[PDB]
């Protein structure tokens, strides 16, 4: 389990919209159509989304380019 | 009964009217959870109507607090009973001594 979000805050500090970003990733994996990029501790797709934000390869631009990429490819 | 106590609860339990006491005590004849009867001694009696004193014990009954109340015999049988002796215990009472 993630100890503290302050690590992802060190990645990109916002804390205002991190609810919407991590809720958007955990929404993509929770509704279906997305796969976890992190080895699972048995934590659910939400904590997998927290570790995905901590990975550094998921952000606002990644959700915009990936979202428009799935919308254009679909 | 509380192993640490006062001794006022001895009078409180009998004076609270919860326990079943005995009037004109005597040699007990028949016992039961529903009823208790006592043969009254000839020391003090009324000349008319003769008879002996009968008691009807209340079974498990609902209270206003949704609790359980009942009275249980403290005597076996054939035991002499004086005036004012408690025959049965109410809820949270042991041998006429209050234990809640």
């Amino acid at each position: 389990a993630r100890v503290t979000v302050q690590d992802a805050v060190e990645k990109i500090g916002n804390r205002f919209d991190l609810v919407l970003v991590a809720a958007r990733r955990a929404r993509q994996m929770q509704v279906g159509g997305k796969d976890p990029l992190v080895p699972e501790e048995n934590d659910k797709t939400t904590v997998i989304a927290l570790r995905e934000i901590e990975e550094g390869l998921i952000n606002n631009q990644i959700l915009d380019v990936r979202e428009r990429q799935e919308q254009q490819e679909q | 009964k509380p192993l640490v106590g006062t001794g006022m609860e001895r009078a409180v339990a009998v004076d609270s009217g919860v326990t079943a006491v005995a009037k004109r005590g005597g040699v007990v004849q028949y016992v039961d959870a529903s009823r208790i009867v006592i043969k009254v001694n000839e020391d003090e009696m009324y000349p008319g109507e003769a008879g002996i004193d009968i008691y009807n014990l209340t079974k498990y009954t609902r209270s206003n607090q949704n609790t359980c109340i009942n009275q249980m015999p403290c005597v076996s049988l054939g035991e002499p009973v004086e005036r004012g002796d408690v025959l049965a215990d109410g809820p949270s009472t042991d041998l006429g001594e209050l234990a809640l």
């Binding site: - | 509380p2 192993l3 640490v4 607090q65 809640l100």
Partner: protein, 50 residues
């Protein structure tokens, strides 16, 4: 009179008995106060409250 009676009951006058752990079996440091007190059960049970 409390320590006189409790001392007459063969118990240690200080009211403290050496106690061992039920889990690990090791002894707790220093004597420990134990006794028997009157407790109370109320209507606050969490089937009624909860």
């Amino acid at each position: 009179e409390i320590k006189e009676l409790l001392k007459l009951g063969d118990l240690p006058t200080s009211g403290q008995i050496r106690l061992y752990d039920g889990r690990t079996g090791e002894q707790f440091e220093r004597p420990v106060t134990v006794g028997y007190m009157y407790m109370l059960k109320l209507n606050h049970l969490v089937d009624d409250k909860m």
